[PDB]
Amino acid sequence: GTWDDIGQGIGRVAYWVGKALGNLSDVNQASRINRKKKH
C-alpha cells in the first residue's frame, strides 16, 4: 500500500506545517479541562 510512502512524508511534513500554521489545535481541546486552572 502507498500508505508506506505517503506515511513517511506526511510524518516529517506534518512537523513543518504545524509551525507554519502556528501549532495550537490540540490546545483548543485542552481548554475543556484547562479553564478550571487557567487563573
UniProtKB/Swiss-Prot annotation:
Keyword Metal-binding appears in the UniProt entry: no
Biological process (GO), any one: defense response to bacterium
Keyword Transferase part of the UniProt annotation: no
Alphabetical keyword list: Antibiotic, Antimicrobial, Bacteriocin
Pfam families named in the record: Antimicrobial17 (PF08129)
Source superkingdom: Bacteria
InterPro entries: Alpha_enterocin/lactococcin
Subunit structure as annotated in this protein's UniProt entry: Bacteriocin activity requires interaction of alpha and beta peptides in a molar ratio of 7:1 or 8:1 respectively.
Function in brief: Kills Lactococci.
Protein name: Bacteriocin lactococcin-G subunit alpha
Organism: Lactococcus lactis subsp. lactis
